[PDB]
Amino acid sequence: IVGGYTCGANTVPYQVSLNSGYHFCGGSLINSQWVVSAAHCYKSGIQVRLGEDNINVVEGNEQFISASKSIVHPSYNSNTLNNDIMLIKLKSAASLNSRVASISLPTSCASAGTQCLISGWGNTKSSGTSYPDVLKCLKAPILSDSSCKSAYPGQITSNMFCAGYLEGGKDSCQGDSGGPVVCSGKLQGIVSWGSGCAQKNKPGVYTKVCNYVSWIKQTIASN
Numbered sequence: 001i002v003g004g005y006t007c008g009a010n011t012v013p014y015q016v017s018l019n020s021g022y023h024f025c026g027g028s029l030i031n032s033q034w035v036v037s038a039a040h041c042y043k044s045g046i047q048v049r050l051g052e053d054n055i056n057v058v059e060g061n062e063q064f065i066s067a068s069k070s071i072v073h074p075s076y077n078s079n080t081l082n083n084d085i086m087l088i089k090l091k092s093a094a095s096l097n098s099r100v101a102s103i104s105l106p107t108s109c110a111s112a113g114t115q116c117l118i119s120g121w122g123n124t125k126s127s128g129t130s131y132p133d134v135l136k137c138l139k140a141p142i143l144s145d146s147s148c149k150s151a152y153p154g155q156i157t158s159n160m161f162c163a164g165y166l167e168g169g170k171d172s173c174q175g176d177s178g179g180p181v182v183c184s185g186k187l188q189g190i191v192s193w194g195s196g197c198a199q200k201n202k203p204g205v206y207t208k209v210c211n212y213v214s215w216i217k218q219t220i221a222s223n
């Protein structure tokens with residue numbers, strides 16, 4: 001996250017870190033046994049790390065649970081990033097409390113102008129690199145559809161939204177991939193892609209989760 005603030009330990013209780021020997025993607029806990037992330041985060045051998053603030057220090061609220069199954073969306077296209085969403089089932093159910101909690105799925109899509117919280121452990125610089133060890137937060141609005149398609153001509157599908165600032169300086173960034181965009185207590189977006197980070201007129205692009213709610217529900221009811 002570029003131009004954000006330190007969230008505070010366990011203040012984003014649904015945030016997960018996907019680990020394959022190192023943090024490589026964020027994700028969101030949607031119930032005690034399922035995590036949703038970005039399909040471009042797919043990897044074999046994922047351990048899900050819950051209750052994290054400092055991902056390099058065991059601080060006492062962590063739950064490390066290995067993945068038993070991963071399901072990439074059936075129409076994921078890695079060239080266009082259309083339908084960049086994946087579900088991960090945990091080998092055992094997470095123990096839920098004030099610091100480890102699931103986030104609600106939306107019943108309605110969020111409108112442009114809605115303020116949202118984006119969070120993750122990714123790069124905090126738009127120019128060069130510096131990775132935080134503690135969780136970073138960013139409040140950003142959902143941008144209008146037409147400003148989103150104007151910033152990314154011929155690249156925005158109906159399964160994407162832009163969120164952020166056309167002026168730049170505040171954005172999600174590499175390593176924030178798969179992480180949550182929560183608006184009014186509901187998961188609305190997944191950190192998906194963008195042109196660099198925090199660049200002028202190149203806002204972050206997010207997977208529009210409200211389009212996938214029935215595939216998610218159907219899939220966890222059957223797996």
Ligand SMILES: [NH3+][C@H]1C[C@@H]1c1ccccc1
Nearest residue numbers: 172173174193194196204
């Ligand atoms: N414009 C930056 C939000 C987009 C981003 C870049 C790389 C990884 C995740 C998100």
Ligand SMILES: [Ca+2]
Nearest residue numbers: 054057058059
């Ligand atoms: Ca830790």
